[PDB]
Chain A
């Protein structure tokens, strides 16, 4: 990955990446995008210097996106779920969809829908957690029931077996870097196995996935640009537009729209989908519209907290008004309400940012910048 090349070089204190004399240079555009990507992941600071998080990611042998997710994953014993999600994403999708099954027989589609509703319990608006469900459900399926489980649930056995092996290997890498006894850690099947995550654990997981994919977050068109795209309760979910955070503003906004994939759990939801959605990537497949590979839905403040480490989030001046006193402790320390802006700056009309809900925050003045410390 180009970001891996940049991440490694920055850990070597090599400053000039663009003009570096590579034997086989990557494209300058890719290097610039790669540098920008690392900043969003908090690996490189505003001056393009490696940070403490950045040094750790350089140690990992995985791509920086997955490396970032694992680093912030050692909280509230949610690591076993993240390892399952990262492993499942790396190997691939194990779900055989109705289109592949050619059933888009009436009894078989009912079983297919039942099998999908079987794995849909973790969260209504998230597809990545469904991917977590099958992987975790696998560990409790004994050897003699594997083929029945795959056949019953329309899953790919060989892809599933690869996932389980990757979980053990992936967990070893994380514990080795994080744990004090770096070399000595040994993985066990019992560590991989875990019970259903609690509701608070589910919310933390969505934040954890957001850390990997901050830049890959989309908002509905109705929120940012009401009436630019006609919306009604009658409109199906797959027809609801979304806009990525960093999409360039075309003369016509309809081009920048993205739409939910039919296979996603969001399709059968019926009700209005989440305003903010986190996607793995975009696919031009489908002549009508571009599709978004959804992972989970993030709320406003959770997005602000994750984007806080990166440079994709900008903060306003202290809000003042009814019950909005800016408590000030020292000349360089204050507490105030601020309306966060995520994405492009208001001055920057090329890229398409937006404003998040106001939140109380603690700010400390560093180098003339009221840098944020934590949300109150």
Chain B
């Protein structure tokens, strides 16, 4: 794990709010990877 050393953009309410509501970004890369592979193929 990596720990952020910069000021968090999310206010303390937001972090609690977000956790109230494996990774979307990771799946975002997966879709792009498939698109890049398909175009290259």
Direct contact of A and B (CB under 8 A): no
Q: Which residues of A contact B (CB under 8 A)?
A: none
